[PDB]
Amino acid sequence: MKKTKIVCTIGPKTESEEMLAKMLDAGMNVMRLNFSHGDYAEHGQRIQNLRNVMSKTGKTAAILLDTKGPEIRTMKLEGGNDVSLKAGQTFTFTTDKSVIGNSEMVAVTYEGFTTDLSVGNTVLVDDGLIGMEVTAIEGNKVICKVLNNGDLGENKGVNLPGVSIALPALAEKDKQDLIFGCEQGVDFVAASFIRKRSDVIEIREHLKAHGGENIHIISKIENQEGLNNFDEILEASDGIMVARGDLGVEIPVEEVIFAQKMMIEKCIRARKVVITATQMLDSMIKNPRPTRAEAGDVANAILDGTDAVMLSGESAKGKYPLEAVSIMATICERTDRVMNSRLKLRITEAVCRGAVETAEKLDAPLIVVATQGGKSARAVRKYFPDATILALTTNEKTAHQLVLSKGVVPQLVKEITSTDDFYRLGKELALQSGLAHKGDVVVMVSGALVPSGTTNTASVHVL
Amino acid sequence: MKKTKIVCTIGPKTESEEMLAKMLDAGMNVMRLNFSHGDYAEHGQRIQNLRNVMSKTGKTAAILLDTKGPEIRTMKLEGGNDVSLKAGQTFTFTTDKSVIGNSEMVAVTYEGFTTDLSVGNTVLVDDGLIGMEVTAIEGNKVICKVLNNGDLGENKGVNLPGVSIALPALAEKDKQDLIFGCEQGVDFVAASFIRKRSDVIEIREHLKAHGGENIHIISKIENQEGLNNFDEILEASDGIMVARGDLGVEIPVEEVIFAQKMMIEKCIRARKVVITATQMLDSMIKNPRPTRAEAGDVANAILDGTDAVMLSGESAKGKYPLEAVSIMATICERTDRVMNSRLEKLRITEAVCRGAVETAEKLDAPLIVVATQGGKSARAVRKYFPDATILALTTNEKTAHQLVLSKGVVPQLVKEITSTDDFYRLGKELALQSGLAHKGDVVVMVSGALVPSGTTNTASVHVL
Amino acid sequence: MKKTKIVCTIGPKTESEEMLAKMLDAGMNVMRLNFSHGDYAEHGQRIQNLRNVMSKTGKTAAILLDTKGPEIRTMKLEGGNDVSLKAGQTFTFTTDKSVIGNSEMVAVTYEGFTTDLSVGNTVLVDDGLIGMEVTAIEGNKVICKVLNNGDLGENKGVNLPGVSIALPALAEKDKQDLIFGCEQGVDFVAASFIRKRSDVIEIREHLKAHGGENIHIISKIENQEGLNNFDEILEASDGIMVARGDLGVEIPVEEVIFAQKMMIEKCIRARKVVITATQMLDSMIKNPRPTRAEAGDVANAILDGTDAVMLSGESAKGKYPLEAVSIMATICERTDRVMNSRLEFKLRITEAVCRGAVETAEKLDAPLIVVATQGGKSARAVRKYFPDATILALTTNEKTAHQLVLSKGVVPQLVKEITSTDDFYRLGKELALQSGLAHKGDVVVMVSGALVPSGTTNTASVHVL
Amino acid sequence: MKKTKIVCTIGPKTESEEMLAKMLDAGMNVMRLNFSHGDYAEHGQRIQNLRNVMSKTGKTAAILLDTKGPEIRTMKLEGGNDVSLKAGQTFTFTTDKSVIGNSEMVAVTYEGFTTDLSVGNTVLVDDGLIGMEVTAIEGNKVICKVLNNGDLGENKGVNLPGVSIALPALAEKDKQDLIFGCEQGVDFVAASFIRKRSDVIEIREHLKAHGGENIHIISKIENQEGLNNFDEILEASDGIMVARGDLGVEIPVEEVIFAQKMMIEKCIRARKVVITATQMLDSMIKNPRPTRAEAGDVANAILDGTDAVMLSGESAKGKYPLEAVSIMATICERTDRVMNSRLEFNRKLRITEAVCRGAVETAEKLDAPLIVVATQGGKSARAVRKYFPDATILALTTNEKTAHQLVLSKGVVPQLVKEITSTDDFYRLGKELALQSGLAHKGDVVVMVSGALVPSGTTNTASVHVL
């Protein structure tokens, strides 16, 4: 009876129908396809396997495509050997991709490394392992002074704290991956390294161009620029993914937690899904139990008010995926049990808030919602109702998409002819769902005599 | 645009169709038929006239039948001449008509004055003018001691606080009047001499016996016993009439105010209509303008939260009825203008209606449209004193008439309401058509869906 | 056990020490001296009598001087007989006093009757008995049309609804009446027919000139102009008296109670005393019992949140004064019994501390709030929030001790001196026990001003008796 | 601008006065002396050094003594070499010390290991590295089945989840350490492995017996039994230390989070100090920067409402003590910056509660940047602190111990005064010191809280002043 949802990164070890079924049973709600690794055949087969399991078992789940995204990385070294960098030495970055790199200098993939950077800026290498301060920028070169000792290797990630990185919204591979996403008919697209509105709009147009207009865009906030432009990004997006690990490398350490809480809170207010990802249960990639701190982080993330929590590497390429999903689910359950509701504003707001409040007054274990796009369910969900949300819809895509929202059980129905019919059918399905029984009060929310996008009716019934 | 309703007692001076129309224009909402004096031809004609005015103008109104009830009075004295009494002496009451007695002893009209009464009880005469306490009970006589000086007159009213008089709520005249009421198909019956729940039940039974089961009973609280059993009387009744003047004769002046307020509050809580009736604008029976104290009293009575106010004598046999109704209406509007909403085992109806008013208030909705069969939903919404006017759609004419007595509700008779969506459509149409709301205004729409009649469970917000 | 205070107009039947004692026992708190009637010897004797009763019994009370004020009256008629006026006729008012007046015309005392009035204005005579509409104004005459039939007599009051009457704030006798008041050392001055702030300023300035600077001025709102300019009058005044009867003839009838309610509300907020006065229990002048409506009126006036209620004629020249005071006290008690506190959600320190004091007192079930005051401000500041607890006011100022008698739910106590805050707590606790209003074990909240002059209240302390 | 206090475990890296001074500048408020290691001369030297720094700089600080406590540990192995235990094997624990231990069996130091433990119970070894399931208990032996592969070594700690361990409240060394604590006149004593009220009482009596009655006892909750008896333990104690690391091996992991939050909450209500300890910034033992997760953990611990946060190892034997204290202080400042007041809104509460709540409320209402408090024992300051006032608490006291001890309470600045003769005197002196502190300025509103005409333990008067 947990409400917060679980996104599971599926890989070679958990792609089989058996494992997927066990994963769904364990508490999995959404399959993440990390396009940082794999080819189309694999991902396609995972999709097919999952949906067949879904078809066979009658279990519900969503499919999310996570792009690799554009990134600045170092390149090849002399003889393929790592080098050791010392503190205080003159290190240089060149934008020439033909350059093989040694101690003194290395090449980067980004053609704007010289342009975007300024003298005094910080350059981090290999997930913040090695830090450098730019001393000079000349021609195609960026001359820096090393701040700390460390060993540089091949193809390491580069982070530029507080720097606006003129990279495209989509790498060329990402564009093709999105087309694949449209072909497969995924429910979500998690766009990596979103820094501004134009990026999201570009994602949207790219989708639109290949019949993916109904696919929801989850903007991944990974650095300061994206955090600064969070409002427009959120307004333009259908959801947000809080990437703590990257933020930990991009912004001051003491600020990440408030970025998470702030983004979660704003996501909650906007009735849009939010996912807290990375650095979740990483220790369980090799161990059968997570550490206390991890459980704490996850629990607190749930208490912040997250729609979903994500497993990355634990469930994909880890030695104990089911254990991770299981303990994650227990944490979810334990945390959800003790959370309470949070009670010019418009119709939808007043009606949904009033519906939750009314539900709370009458000890209703269920709030049934008639939805076409999924907006009403999220509108009711906004207030963290004690009641489970039974979202009845004739749209599979939204039915799938609602799987990601907290505390909502979506259900596909043939048709809803009217409001009274919705009440009848809703009562029937409310009893059929097993979430409520005879004698229980149920609150029923819908849009009457209005187009989609407005919630204005609330009705109380006894089962 | 007043919310509080005005009940007007109609008499020969105000029975005409033109005058009734003028009275309706002035602010009249309900016609009171005081059967304390008059015949069936008059009242019937009054009813017919009102209904004619209603038919021609398209104006809505209710008809209230007020029973006279039984009374204990003193009897005949020497030569039809006045007399005089003394304090501290031995006054005696006998259950014997033939006995005449100016002082020392007196006869009463009620057979069993000796029987029901007990030693220690108080006997009041002429609206509490003279009080005495029962000293002993023997045979056909009961000796009492006078507590205060006063002059006794011919055939004066008698009050017995806390004493069960054991007379029925209805005499043969009241019974026939009530049957007449059922025949005429009146909307309300204001029952006199209600002391306890059984009295109300008897009225109900008499009604039901003549096809008046849907007629609402307004119980008149006019005595101490009725005040003690107010809860049961209220539970059994459809509404209450607060008779301050009559209570003033049975209880201390210091308790009447809070008795009124308490009865009004409890009536409001129970979704039962309440009427403040006696000593309203009595001076306007003789004068064209009321006194400050009266207007103040009325205003405070409205502020207490009464559904309606009654003119009794001002509108019936007074020289300035139209003026009284007018100034009453101005007072009503003026008082209603500055009143705020009053938000609140808790059930559905309560939660939905309260939530509906709250939602209406939050969104600046000028109208709350309500679907009603029995009228309970409109009254349930009214309970919270909505700033918005209640537009009550019903297929029941009786309730449509009866809702005229409830505060801030405009009843509307419709042919049919087939469903909830149909109710929303028709409600929007009539909301616009009524002129109380226009394009752009939000309206909250309240009804019962897939539930019995007496239950309200749906609230929906729409834009016109 | 009542909180609402009772002002009683004293006359020949209640002028004796015995009756005054009885009146105090019945529930009287303040003596009103209506200088519309009486001479200086009489009023002086009343004052002396009250002070004697107070000295002998040891009970506390206040003395209020009510001025007559300026008046517009009609004058004498032919043969000293009333005349009967008919509606629609031509009645004229003349400024020539020497004129004896008949049906057609009568003289008035005010020489600006033509100036202040305009065509269309209403002229009322004898407490709204006779109404007239101004048709024309010529020379020293005001030509009017009678609206209703009535008998006009000699020396009748004239009322002008909604008309600004350019009469002075003080009549010639009133100055000497106030001087007498200062000499006698009265506690309050009730000024009649206050229409504007300047009037209050004039009274205050006059009192200031004769050692009456410490006397509180209560402005009587009796007409449209005074009501329209109520805020400035309240700001300028120390208190207000709501004259319903006088307002009732001056403003629309449906507006009188909301004027009362509005004015009472503002007085409490301003921490100034308010008195609900005229048309209280007048029926008890001839009858031994009040009417229901009157009792209702008193109760509602108290429920509005008035500090005190006034008897005018009931207590002076009525057949049943003691009965009136008694039933008044009973009504006060019955109404006060069911009133609760008003704990908001401008305001400053004093407000915050006093509000907090009441809050804490009620939170801890304290039946008593002891307050140290020099001017009486802290007690009224605490009183503003209608504490369930009785307010015990300690003072080294006799005048404030007298004046606090009018404030609701305040028991004044004259103390020798208050040397410090701890000393105040000690003395307050002691006197709290001595008062008998509190007992051993009871919690008491103690409010005072620490390290600040006598105009701000900043300390609140909780003690157990 | 931070209100949350920082407890720093001092070691070889931070034992000098210079380092102590820098540590105080960095944000250190309390020195923790971990008696799991060291001798009296060393700790004494540490105390002397801190007190010297305090004497020279005029800075205030507290000294907290952390006991090693009793423990169940394994004993010696063959040749001093690790042995490898495999999953599914029959392992045995013996109460015979003289036994040197191999792959099959090892001895434990605790004699009631046989008695307290039962069949089915779990046995964890070496900080939960190796887990075993008890299959049978015979004689002096406890037969168990190993659940996971692992290497067992010499002198490793043993944890018994959910087991009531009849160990004494105080080890023999702890007692002499406490006597030393009394000798040195420490401000706090952190008692290890508290499971029940009696344990607290024993320590209290032991202190009392050696003139340490004014020393505050912080009960360290490290297992389920202590968590079960938390209320009475808190009742008997002056404060609590939430040992998350120890809890993580003793109770279900998903329960640890709410145990921390629950205990912080109850400590706040009880007007007693609470310290969130262990697994704070451990990564900084090796690195110059903490992990995001660590900062998050600390921040949330502060947001839960802990009075203080504790460094253990970061400040003692780490390569980056200053960095750890500094970033810790930064976290404290950043987190404290955005916290709001928590005003009550359990049926009946008394005077002190009403006065203090009302004082904070009034303080907030008038935008008072400072609340001055008169205290003898520190209860009033802690009583005011309960509501997390935005205003700083300036605590005036004639008690040196209380001045020192209040350094641990959140958002309170203690000040030692010679005398307070009366309430007006307190207002005068308080206003003076309020101005002198630089925490308030001319014109600013100050709320002044104290006990007037009442014994110690009672706060009953609150007064508003303009400086």
Short mmCIF file of C-alpha atoms in Angstrom, two decimals, chain B residues 324-434:
data_model
loop_
_atom_site.label_atom_id
_atom_site.label_comp_id
_atom_site.label_asym_id
_atom_site.label_seq_id
_atom_site.Cartn_x
_atom_site.Cartn_y
_atom_site.Cartn_z
CA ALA B 324 -44.53 48.68 7.72
CA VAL B 325 -43.67 46.11 5.06
CA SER B 326 -41.50 48.69 3.30
CA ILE B 327 -39.55 49.83 6.37
CA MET B 328 -39.29 46.18 7.43
CA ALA B 329 -37.80 45.39 4.02
CA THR B 330 -35.33 48.29 4.26
CA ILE B 331 -34.30 47.08 7.72
CA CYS B 332 -33.95 43.56 6.33
CA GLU B 333 -31.76 44.66 3.41
CA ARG B 334 -29.74 46.96 5.66
CA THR B 335 -29.07 44.22 8.21
CA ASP B 336 -28.44 41.48 5.64
CA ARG B 337 -25.99 43.76 3.81
CA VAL B 338 -23.33 43.48 6.54
CA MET B 339 -23.77 39.83 7.59
CA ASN B 340 -20.99 37.32 6.94
CA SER B 341 -21.07 33.60 6.20
CA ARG B 342 -21.14 31.09 9.03
CA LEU B 343 -19.09 28.08 8.10
CA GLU B 344 -19.97 25.25 10.50
CA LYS B 345 -20.53 12.40 13.62
CA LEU B 346 -20.25 14.40 10.41
CA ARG B 347 -22.12 13.15 7.30
CA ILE B 348 -22.08 13.73 3.58
CA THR B 349 -24.76 16.45 3.12
CA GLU B 350 -23.09 18.58 5.82
CA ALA B 351 -19.62 18.33 4.30
CA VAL B 352 -20.80 18.84 0.71
CA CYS B 353 -23.03 21.83 1.47
CA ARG B 354 -20.46 23.51 3.73
CA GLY B 355 -17.74 22.82 1.18
CA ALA B 356 -20.04 24.16 -1.53
CA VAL B 357 -20.60 27.44 0.30
CA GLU B 358 -16.89 27.70 1.10
CA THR B 359 -15.96 27.03 -2.53
CA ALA B 360 -18.58 29.56 -3.67
CA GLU B 361 -17.18 32.14 -1.25
CA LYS B 362 -13.59 31.43 -2.33
CA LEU B 363 -14.41 31.99 -6.02
CA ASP B 364 -16.72 35.01 -5.59
CA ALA B 365 -19.71 33.07 -6.94
CA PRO B 366 -22.88 35.21 -6.95
CA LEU B 367 -25.14 32.14 -7.19
CA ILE B 368 -25.47 28.68 -5.70
CA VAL B 369 -27.86 26.68 -7.87
CA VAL B 370 -29.55 23.80 -6.07
CA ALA B 371 -31.64 20.84 -7.23
CA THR B 372 -34.41 20.04 -4.74
CA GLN B 373 -37.36 17.67 -4.41
CA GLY B 374 -38.19 18.18 -0.74
CA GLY B 375 -36.31 21.44 -0.31
CA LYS B 376 -33.79 20.08 2.19
CA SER B 377 -30.73 20.82 0.03
CA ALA B 378 -31.50 24.53 -0.31
CA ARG B 379 -32.03 24.74 3.45
CA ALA B 380 -28.84 22.75 3.97
CA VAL B 381 -26.96 25.30 1.88
CA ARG B 382 -28.82 28.15 3.60
CA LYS B 383 -27.61 26.86 6.98
CA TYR B 384 -24.21 28.48 6.42
CA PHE B 385 -25.54 31.93 5.45
CA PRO B 386 -24.06 32.05 1.93
CA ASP B 387 -23.30 35.48 0.48
CA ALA B 388 -24.53 34.00 -2.79
CA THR B 389 -28.24 33.77 -3.53
CA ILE B 390 -29.59 30.23 -3.69
CA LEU B 391 -31.41 29.41 -6.94
CA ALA B 392 -33.49 26.36 -6.04
CA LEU B 393 -34.82 24.31 -8.96
CA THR B 394 -37.64 21.89 -8.12
CA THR B 395 -40.42 19.83 -9.72
CA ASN B 396 -42.42 20.09 -6.50
CA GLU B 397 -44.61 23.17 -6.31
CA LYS B 398 -45.24 22.74 -2.58
CA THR B 399 -41.52 22.92 -1.79
CA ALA B 400 -41.14 25.73 -4.32
CA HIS B 401 -43.71 27.65 -2.29
CA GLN B 402 -42.25 26.50 1.03
CA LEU B 403 -38.72 27.59 0.11
CA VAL B 404 -40.08 31.14 -0.07
CA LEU B 405 -39.94 31.15 3.73
CA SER B 406 -36.26 30.14 3.83
CA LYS B 407 -33.59 32.86 3.85
CA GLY B 408 -31.78 33.97 0.70
CA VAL B 409 -33.29 31.33 -1.58
CA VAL B 410 -35.12 31.98 -4.85
CA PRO B 411 -37.32 28.98 -5.73
CA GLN B 412 -37.96 27.97 -9.34
CA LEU B 413 -40.53 25.45 -10.55
CA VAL B 414 -39.26 23.41 -13.49
CA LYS B 415 -40.98 20.64 -15.44
CA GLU B 416 -38.17 18.11 -15.12
CA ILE B 417 -34.52 17.50 -14.26
CA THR B 418 -33.43 14.25 -15.91
CA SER B 419 -29.81 14.05 -14.76
CA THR B 420 -26.85 15.83 -13.19
CA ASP B 421 -25.49 17.15 -16.50
CA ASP B 422 -29.04 18.15 -17.44
CA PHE B 423 -29.30 19.88 -14.06
CA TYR B 424 -26.08 21.77 -14.77
CA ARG B 425 -27.30 22.81 -18.23
CA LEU B 426 -30.77 23.85 -17.07
CA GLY B 427 -29.26 25.43 -13.97
CA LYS B 428 -26.88 27.52 -16.06
CA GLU B 429 -29.74 28.52 -18.36
CA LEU B 430 -32.04 29.54 -15.50
CA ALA B 431 -29.14 31.15 -13.62
CA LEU B 432 -28.53 33.42 -16.61
CA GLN B 433 -32.27 33.79 -17.24
CA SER B 434 -32.92 34.86 -13.63
#
